[PDB]
Design a protein around this nucleic acid. Structure first.
Lengths: 95, 97, 121, 83, 102, 83, 97, 95, 109, 102
DNA sequence: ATCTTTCCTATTGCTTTAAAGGCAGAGGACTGTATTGATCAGTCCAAACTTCTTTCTGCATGTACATGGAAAACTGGCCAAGGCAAACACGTCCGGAATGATGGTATTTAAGAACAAACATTCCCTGGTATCAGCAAGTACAGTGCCCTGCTGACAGAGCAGGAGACACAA
DNA sequence: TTGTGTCTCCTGCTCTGTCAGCAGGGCACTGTACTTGCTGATACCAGGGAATGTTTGTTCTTAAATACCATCATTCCGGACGTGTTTGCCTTGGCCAGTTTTCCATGTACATGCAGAAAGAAGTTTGGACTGATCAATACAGTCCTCTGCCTTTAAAGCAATAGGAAAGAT
């Protein structure tokens, strides 16, 4: 058998429908989006790991992710992203 | 007498076309041959995936486009419209390459 | 005991579309830290979803400007480079089958001369 | 089998097109040799790392993922190839 | 071998006509085409998708579901009774005024 | 307590000395304002990251290691203080 | 008659002096005040280690020295020996800032 | 006394004595050398971890370190370092 | 009875700490597991690079009539060597200054 | 026909005065001169350039542009009001005390 | 070309503080034994790489005419180099404190470990509409012949005032 | 009867009309190329069925992290004073910018040749999957010694002063 090929195409597609129900996305565009998601994930995870190592934290909490997002994202992207993350975490905690 | 565009018009039209388009500008097979020849020194009898060669061509084209943009900026800074090897050398030195 | 309550995905609980569980698994397998918090995957997924939404919105706007409906790498490149913050975030990134922003320096533009006769030296 | 003179494969019109995409209006004759030299240096730098990655995997086929890692290792992050 | 002197439309029409139930799935259509034309043994991912495009674009082919769950995967395909004589009288390659429902 | 206009603290002789260390022989008058602006932008960019790192540790003192991390994140690694 | 060096000799002498030396060129106290002025915008009552201020000063001086070297190279490219704001702008643009 | 803060000063000093028995080194130079050693260690370790992740392996062996050294060090410096590492591992293997 | 313990650095004939390198690798979250030869190899490479840089710095110091290495000597050694300069191209050295360099066109006639 | 016993200044003045709008372009001036003087139908370039010089030189003629793009391609030319009857009553070939603005 | 002036470089003494050396100790590194599952070793699929062949152009090379952009030369003026004098604000020490980074212990709550359930995510068919390729029209702008509007230096020839001849007034 | 004023006709300087000719600015017409419409082809986005392995739920547990309090260290602030550096001014000279001139090398256009691209096929190498196994790393316990910190010591380098030599500038 051939190895399973997991990806984020379905989730990116759902987000696209949420923001633009009408427009589509090409396969190469889907791959580029997956690459972008992987790159951002790696950057944020590495930043959080470095922050924890500096603070000798054995675990990565939402605060570390917030710090990484603030450090990496420039200007308004950091603020809106932080707001969205806080809203999501609050909603998760409420249930 | 037959029509003849003044110098500059064709160059600007080409600039507009190649900035508006996105297709590759380097021929594929000679680039593949060059890649294989360069790889021969590091190791002999290697194999290459087509996607790898395409990625190499994409990266090289992007790097050369950036270098030419920097060269054009340097040439314009010197009150000149013609890029010269000095422009490329200065751009590389400033970029630390 | 207590009878297993019906399962609800953490993505559904947080309201996000991206997979919280997959993000948590990736973080644990990535050796980024000895432990992974419960809220950290949620926060990371939310931020990724927001960034994806922003980029997709800008790309769709660019496509509409081009009278197209399916996003292609050209639309992504235009959206990323036109936006200042995204361009700074992805300044050193390269996109396959991309292009460049239409830009010609004013000096290179043809010299507008009030008197315009046949070309002579 | 042995290749010797592929560097000339980078044709003068190809360099002209690359410069045009960069907005170059006028090109000097000596640019082409310098362009070939710089391109050869960059190709060697990338391909050395790619070959190192391939050898460390104990494989004899260079994969696009190796190219992506080599380019990212040099700060030239590339998308659209599974990176 | 070169391509046969028959379009995908004609090939699909013959495959449906020769079926005992006058209906086939894509797997059966591929099997029939490969068996009766050696040229289509190769380029499978290309010509199978081309047959898909033919069956899906052309309204003259209309689908039928499987009632008692059958083997399951793959709904049937049937020729539209209103198609009539389209590839008949020596027009296998091209069908003049391709069939449209709307 | 509050600070108002210390950007003027970068005096013209200091800028001249900095240019001289870079091998500059002749200096135009307008350089001083542009140099001040560029230095201010660079300082703001570094200090933002430094304060962010300081905030994450819940400390109110910006330590040298914070500055080193901030510079390193910008690809400007500095030795002599990472300890 | 009073002795006076012609223009440029003192410039070369100063260049040699400050290329041979290593000490900081920016006055410490006003630079520290500037850093505090920039710092307070993000948060009030921020403390700062002396070593942090020295490291910031070192980084700023190194960055400015590199920028000035690139500016001088660009000025020489245009057949000029005097740096101008356009030179710094070109250097920053090519460096990618 | 305060909490112990480890540094590579003694090792660099021993190496300095080996190469130049007569000369000395300053404290600021010592700190710079320590920072250099830490930076090189971090670079090599990160490259080895990335190689292991690409190969989907859980352990980092001398082969990964050699790969990282070849990828990082330029030109002659790389091969000499590879030879030194091979010599050291060969000596250690004999126990 | 337990025999005389020997440092892994002594077993490999290196000065650098094999044990400290291994502990840092394990504690750095680089991978789930760490090989035995990996810390030895890394310590050997680090020792070789340190020896090369120290030798060049000592040569530079002897050129400057000094006996104790200083950041100026380190910068001189690093930037004068092409390979080390390329390795540390982006690195900044505190109190290191810059090499003496004046463009030819600026020189007087 | 010989040269008409009239100066080009007199010809321009008459052309301007007889115009319904008291203003004419160079093309209209040429057309009027050619129509009313068969002599000027030949050697067009010489006397046309002479008229150009006279218009550009004599202050008694002042140009008026055409604002809403009109037919376009040519500005109107009008007599300066202070000129008065300068060539009237038998002095066509040579005026006396030519007009000066300042 | 040789003399004056300036600056850099080097030499010698004092000191100081920065680096070398001695001693205590501790916590992390060495030794020894067992588990293991992460790695190594052997065999097969197939699929994906490499290799070879035929055609058709689209591309690259070769050639020739020529203009305007690169280069050089000269002038000037105004920008900035060079130097003097005064003022102050940077730099140094001396001390207060107060602010806060870090150590020690409790506990709590958060997440790691294990197993069952499962359903969300993946793989293989399926309809249909959005994107790529080729030929043909409208739109857009470039280039340039030609003309109108300015100016400049000089020649050719009618105007009308000045002077001479003819005629009539005055003495 | 004789001399001279006034009217009239010829003469001659004045002044205007005409010519040749170079510079800017602007318009209409031809020509070339870019973009869009139509058509055809196609490929990939979304509904339907089966599968599997990853996520959620539940419980236990234990230690990472938070909180509280204690401690000292190290940075902020003020005060006084030294005097080196900066600011302001003045002179003037030479470097950047403007203008002009030269000329040659890049651009543009067209003609010819040729190999890159793509279809098709064949040959072939090994990347990855699977099973058996085996061994190198992790886990845990004991102990011992290597590296860090404090205190002492001494000498390499910085500060101060002087003197020798190099080199710039000038007639």
């Amino acid at each position: 058998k051939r190895s399973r090929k997991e990806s984020y195409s379905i989730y990116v597609y759902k987000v696209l429908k949420q923001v633009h129900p009408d427009t589509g996305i090409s396969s190469k565009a889907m791959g580029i989006m997956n690459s972008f998601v992987n790159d951002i994930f790696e950057r944020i995870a590495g930043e959080a790991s470095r922050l924890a190592h500096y603070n000798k934290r054995s675990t990565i909490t939402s605060r570390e992710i917030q710090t990484a997002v603030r450090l990496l994202l420039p200007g308004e992207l950091a603020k809106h992203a932080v707001s969205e993350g806080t809203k999501a975490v609050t909603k998760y905690t409420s249930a | 007498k037959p029509h003849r565009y003044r110098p500059g018009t064709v160059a600007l039209r080409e600039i507009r076309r190649y900035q508006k388009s996105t297709e590759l500008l380097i021929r594929k097979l000679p680039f593949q041959r060059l890649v294989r020849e360069i790889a021969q020194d590091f190791k002999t009898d290697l194999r290459f995936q087509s996607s790898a060669v395409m990625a190499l061509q994409e990266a090289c084209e992007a790097y050369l486009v950036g270098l030419f943009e920097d060269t054009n900026l340097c040439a314009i800074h010197a009150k000149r419209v013609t890029i010269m090897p000095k422009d490329i050398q200065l751009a590389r030195r400033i970029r630390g390459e | 005991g207590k009878a297993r309550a019906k399962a609800k995905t953490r993505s559904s609980r947080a309201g996000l579309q991206f997979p919280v569980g997959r993000v948590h698994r990736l973080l644990r397998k990535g050796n980024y830290s000895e432990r992974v918090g419960a809220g950290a995957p949620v926060y990371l997924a939310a931020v990724l979803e927001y960034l994806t939404a922003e980029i997709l919105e800008l790309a769709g706007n660019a496509a509409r400007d081009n009278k197209k409906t399916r996003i292609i790498p050209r639309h992504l490149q235009l959206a990323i480079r036109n936006d200042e913050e995204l361009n700074k975030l992805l300044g050193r990134v390269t996109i396959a089958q991309g292009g460049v922003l239409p830009n010609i320096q004013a000096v290179l533009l043809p010299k507008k001369t009030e008197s315009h006769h046949k070309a002579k030296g | 089998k042995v290749l010797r003179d592929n560097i000339q494969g980078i044709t003068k019109p190809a360099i002209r097109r690359l410069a045009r995409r960069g907005g170059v209006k006028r090109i000097s004759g000596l640019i082409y040799e310098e362009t070939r030299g710089v391109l050869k240096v960059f190709l060697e730098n990338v391909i050395r790392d790619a070959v190192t990655y391939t050898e460390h995997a104990k494989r004899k086929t260079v994969t696009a993922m190796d190219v992506v890692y080599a380019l990212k290792r040099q700060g030239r992050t590339l998308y659209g190839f599974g990176g | 071998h070169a391509k046969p002197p028959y379009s995908y439309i004609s090939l699909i029409t013959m495959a449906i006509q020769q079926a005992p139930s006058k209906m086939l799935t894509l797997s059966e259509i591929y099997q029939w085409i490969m068996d009766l034309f050696p040229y289509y043994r190769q380029n499978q991912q290309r010509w199978q998708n081309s047959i898909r495009h033919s069956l899906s674009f052309n309204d003259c082919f209309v689908k039928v579901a499987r009632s008692p769950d059958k083997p399951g995967k793959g709904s049937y395909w049937t020729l539209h009774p209103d198609s009539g004589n389209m590839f008949e009288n020596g027009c296998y390659l091209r069908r003049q005024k391709r069939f449209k429902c709307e």
